[PDB]
Amino acid sequence: DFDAIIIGAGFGGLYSLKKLRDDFNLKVRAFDRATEVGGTWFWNQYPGALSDSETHLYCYSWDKELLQEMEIKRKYISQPDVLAYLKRVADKHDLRKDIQFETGIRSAYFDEENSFWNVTTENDEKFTARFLITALGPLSSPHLPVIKGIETFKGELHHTSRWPKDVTFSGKRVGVIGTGSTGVQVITAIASQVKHLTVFQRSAQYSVPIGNVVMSETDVAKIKENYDQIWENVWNSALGYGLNESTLPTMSVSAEERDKIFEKAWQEGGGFRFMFETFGDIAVDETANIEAQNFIKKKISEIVKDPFVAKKLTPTDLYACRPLCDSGYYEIFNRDNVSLEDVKANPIVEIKEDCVVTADGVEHKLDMLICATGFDAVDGSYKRIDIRGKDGISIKDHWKDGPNSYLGMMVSNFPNMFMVFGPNGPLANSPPIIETQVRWIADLIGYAEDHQINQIEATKDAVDNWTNTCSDIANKTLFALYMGGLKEYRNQISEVSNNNYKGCLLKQS
């Protein structure tokens, strides 16, 4: 029995714990299958895993001491460091004493008469708790790339989502399936170290340079000295990536101008930035979208010295969402021990003991095959848990037609359950969204303790409104889930919390 159960010990889990335990004095336990805190940063330790967000923003805001303390080696932070960082947050606030590691949750069924949650582990522990905090993140189970004959393969088959330790590249032919962000990081990291790399590319994507430089003692002092301002600007921005968000329209300058603005962002680095700090309409207007793409196509053709290769790396679709970030990805394809296989015009059909076979019957002989093939959507982490609310409805069935929430946090027919980095949340840097959501959830359970209430849920009506509020803003953009940003997200939930949780049925003891 607990005031609250937390599922997860990543960013959202760790803070949920700290806040509910130490700031609101609640009786709380946190669960994670992982042996250590960190979430995705414990699980994903492949070559080149790295924040998209800058080092000084990809962290908690609420411990001012730890900010002055924080190591800031590079502009962006490597997986080990993030894990060291969260590990050290656990150390400082002693949170592990209230985390059971190696302990998956199987089921959670809301008890309607005790107004609390029945949570049963995979081990078969039944714990009771008034409140359910799910911090499962946005990246669910990996994609299992159904490839005929994966069983026959007798070399190393590794998946980025479960990267083993003690992996050696030297002297080996290595295949990489996937050229989204994980696979670009993998390929950039390893192309230098292997005998031969084959990239199996299903869909060429746009990548810009990240520009992950070491941070001088002065650079780091400039950050620390003005850290309070840094955050206030994060809270007063759409993306919370510390960017001079632009309102300048793209086609409202010269071609020679536009060029030079893109070359500035490009020299600086970062995908958000190229897309939101150059101009203000790149995600909304098509001409602008096209202009942004053609800038990158141009870059691709300059860097990639072999035109036929440059061709295969060039996206073909009409409009471009967020570009990936890289650390010399396009450069990779110039080298003599890298080859690109367009696996949409020449797919993988079979896989024998020692090779991947594509459509034209070429046998790609590999010692090692790496799946960098991506994760399921937000709801997959939920749908994969036995979660049942009112009238024994399981989240599986309630969301069978796409995920839904109120404010990204609360679910209809699903009481005392509060989601962190949950679906229909804002598009922005992770740590600020998580802070925002945890603080808000904590205050509401605070309100609940003080107004002696014992049951909170969002209406079906509140939810659709919110589902609508996302579509209206969404359809104002090209992205053919909640946009309009963090600043306006934080407004929206303040408009709710200040109006006695409009759309939440607060039920009383």
Q: Which residues of 221-246 are buried (b: 16+ CB within 10 A; e: fewer)?
A: eebeeebeebbeebeebbbbbbbebb
Vertex 490: Cα angle to 487 and 494 (nearest 5)? 140
Answer for the pair 26, 57: CB distance below 8 angstroms, yes or no: no
CA distance 421 to 390: 23
Q: Does 31 bind ligand FAD (CB under 6 A)?
A: yes
- With both helix axes pointing from N to C terminus, report the angle between 11-18 and 430-450 in degrees, rounded to the nearest 10: 30
Q: Does 52 bind ligand FAD (CB under 6 A)?
A: yes
Q: Residue 42: how many CB atoms within 10 A of its CB?
A: 21
Answer for the pair 188, 165: CB distance below 8 angstroms, yes or no: no
Span near ligand FAD by CB under 6 A; candidates 130-138, 214-222, 291-299, 467-475 = 130-138
CA distance 61 to 58: 9
202 binds, among ligand NAI, ligand FAD, none (CB under 5 to 8 A by kind): ligand NAI
Residue nearest to ligand FAD (CB): 39
Q: Does 40 bind ligand FAD (CB under 6 A)?
A: yes
State in angstroms the smallest separation of the CB of 116 from ligand NAI.
34
Paired residues of 368 in beta bridges: 156, 174
Q: Among 112, 8, 20, which Cα is nearest to 457's?
A: 112
The correct pick among 32, 81, 277, 341 for binding ligand FAD (CB under 6 A) is 32
Nearer to ligand FAD (CB atom), residue 293 or residue 381? 381
137 binds, among ligand FAD, ligand NAI, none (CB under 5 to 8 A by kind): ligand FAD
Span near ligand FAD by CB under 6 A; candidates 8-16, 66-74, 94-102, 273-281 = 8-16
143 binds, among ligand FAD, ligand NAI, none (CB under 5 to 8 A by kind): ligand NAI
Paired residues of 453 in beta bridges: 508
Binding site for ligand NAI (CB under 6 A): 50-52, 139, 143, 145, 177-182, 201-203, 325, 343, 372-375
Q: Does 142 bind ligand FAD (CB under 6 A)?
A: no
The correct pick among 4, 49, 174, 191 for binding ligand FAD (CB under 6 A) is 49
Residue type, position 454, single letter: N
State in angstroms the smallest separation of the CB of 365 from ligand FAD.
30
Q: Does 7 bind ligand FAD (CB under 6 A)?
A: yes
Residue found under tokens 């659709």 = 464
Q: Does 376 bind ligand FAD (CB under 6 A)?
A: no
DSSP string covering 287-322: HHHHHHHHHHHHHHHHH-SSHHHHHHTS--SSS--S
Q: Is 377 exposed, middle or buried (0-12, 13-18, 19+ CB in 10 A)?
A: middle
The correct pick among 24, 33, 93, 107 for binding ligand FAD (CB under 6 A) is 33
Query: Which residues inside 70-89 make contact with ligand FAD, applying CB under 6 A?
Result: 79
Residue found under tokens 């502009």 = 75
Element spanning 78, H or E:
strand 76-78
State in angstroms the smallest separation of the CB of 9 from ligand FAD.
6
State in angstroms the smallest separation of the CB of 358 from ligand FAD.
28
The correct pick among 6, 139, 238, 371 for binding ligand FAD (CB under 6 A) is 139
374 binds, among ligand FAD, ligand NAI, none (CB under 5 to 8 A by kind): ligand NAI
Nearer to ligand NAI (CB atom), residue 177 or residue 463? 177
Q: Does 12 bind ligand FAD (CB under 6 A)?
A: yes
Residue type, position 106, single letter: R
Residues that bind ligand FAD (CB under 6 A): 7-13, 31-34, 39-40, 44, 49, 51-53, 58, 79, 104-105, 135-139, 381, 385, 420-421, 429-430, 434
